[PDB]
Each structure stands twice: as C-alpha cells, then as structure tokens.
Amino acid sequence: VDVPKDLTKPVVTISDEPDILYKRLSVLVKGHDKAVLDSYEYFAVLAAKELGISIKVHEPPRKIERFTLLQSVHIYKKHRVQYEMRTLYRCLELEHLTGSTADVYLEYIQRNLPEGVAMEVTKTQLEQLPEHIKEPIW
C-alpha cells in the first residue's frame, strides 16, 4: 500500500551528432564453470530479445592447460602432481546494432558478469570512406 509515486526517470538526452553503427559485435566470455556460462548465456540472450537485438550463440572449443610439479619437498623425482586450468567459452554473436544500443546492452551484461568470468568484446564498426580518399590529388 506504500507504493511510491512520480517515479523519476533518468535523463536520456538525444543528441544531434549521428550514431555509431556496428555490423556485428562478438562477445566471447571465458569462465571455469560451464553451468555458470549457461546461466550467463540465458541471461544475455534473453536481454537481447527483450531489446530487439539479433543474437546467435555457439561454443568455441575449450582449452585445458596442464602442468606438472614435484610431489615431494626434496627428492622422489618420479612422483609428480599434475594440475590443470580449464577455460570454457561461449560466443554471443550480436548483429546490426547502433552505438547507443550496444552501449546500453554491453554495460548491462558487463555489470552482471559473474565472478570468475572474463569477456572479450570485438566491435566491428561500419564506417565510410575518409574525405581525402574520395578523389586523387594527382
């Protein structure tokens, strides 16, 4: 019964300079758990559909980095302990975004990136020819 009133919305100023265009925007994420990357895929793919972005997902193959250590403090060279670090992947292929759409969506999904997960965001920006390339100077 105590619902607040006159909900103040943030100021989104529409400017007069044009917007960036991204042909695509690949988002690779890297974690140690696959279930965590499954929950982050569900979150990010839903967030894109609730924002009208086209998104495809695939799993790049994993990397298992192993190395060996000695098991004893002094001798016993034949006895080792072996360790690994698995890096699991999921690539979010977004397509046909404007700079502001990207800006909002990345910020959102990056602030909710879980602990132990990294992200590499490749942005393919569309651009037209520089003015100086329009005509030769000869």
């Binding site: 990207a102 800006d103 990345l106 910020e107 990056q110 602030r111 965001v121």
Partner: protein, 131 residues
Amino acid sequence: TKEAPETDTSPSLWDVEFAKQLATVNEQPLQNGFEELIQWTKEGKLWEFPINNEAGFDDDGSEFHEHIFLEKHLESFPKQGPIRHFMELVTCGLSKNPYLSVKQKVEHIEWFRNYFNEKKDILKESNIQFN
C-alpha cells in the same frame, strides 16, 4: 539579479560551510544495492561501464603523429653519415614503442644529442662532423 557577478572573487569559508549543510539535508542511508553502486560511481570508487581499458589514460593528449613522426627532433644531429643512420634506428624503434610517452621518447633522443655532443673529439678523429 545583479548583471555582473564577482566571478573573480572565490567562495569563502561561510560559503562552503553552508554548501556542506545544504547537502546534509538530503543525505539518507543507502536504500538498496543499486544506491551503493550509484554512490560508488559518483565517488569514483567503482568502474564506469561499459568499460574502457584506457579509462583515465589520455596519454598527455598526444596525437598519433607525435609518436610516429620523430624526425623533427633530429634537427640538431648531422644530416648525413653514421649518426643519421644510427639515430634513424633509434627513432624507428621509438616510433614503434606503445609503452612510452612522447616525453619519454624525446628524453631518449635528447640523451643521444647530449652524448654525441660530448664525444666530439672521438667523432672528429673518425672524421664525422657533429655540428
């Protein structure tokens, strides 16, 4: 209001003390997690999203051509000869170094200028005129 304010005059103790307690009016304990992230972003404690890996680094507002084009700094050196050849390798390497500022690069170049200026006699014996 007064057409022309005293912009040259700066606020006084009374002014700022009043500003402090004008803020105390609206200060309330943080209400939820969003408010702490908002408070931390305003204080500069939290990163701003979406992240730029160069957030806070402007590189002394240098332009690309000050890192890449370093021949203007070779004007005090011999225009030909082994010193030119050598310094043309220093600047080629310096012009490829993404870890140095333009100021640091110019320090390297200026060292060799002072260094070859001290070895004039060595350089003159080998018939390489420095200046």
